[PDB]
């Protein structure tokens, strides 16, 4: 426990779980919505993917 010739500093990082509050004023974003599509592909011998 003899002190060496130098001293030293330590750097750490930490993570904190936070339940957050979001506020947004009225009518801030205009959204364009399209017709949804449904497609079929790559039929297995016992299954089909959509």
């Amino acid at each position: 426990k003899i002190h060496p010739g130098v001293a030293m500093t330590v750097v750490r990082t930490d993570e904190i779980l936070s339940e957050n509050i979001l506020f947004s004023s009225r009518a801030s974003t205009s959204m364009f919505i399209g017709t949804p599509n449904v497609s079929r592909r790559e039929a297995r011998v016992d299954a089909v993917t959509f």
């Binding site: 017709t35 949804p36 599509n37 449904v38 497609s39 079929r40 089909v48």
Partner: protein, 73 residues
Amino acid sequence: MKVQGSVDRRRLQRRIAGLLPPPARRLNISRGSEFTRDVRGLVEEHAQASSLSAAAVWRAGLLAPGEVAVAGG
């Protein structure tokens, strides 16, 4: 002048109507309808199996020209 040696005009419409249509893909869904027979066109896998009776076989389409059974005459 209207010699018409080709039989193409007004006959081949009837044959292209049969030989034309592609298998369906990318059909759209509306939440209001949400379930239609047009969906069931794509949903059905359109099976090949026997009821051992003549008219039922005509319905099911086992007597198909292609390799895979196609109903509909």
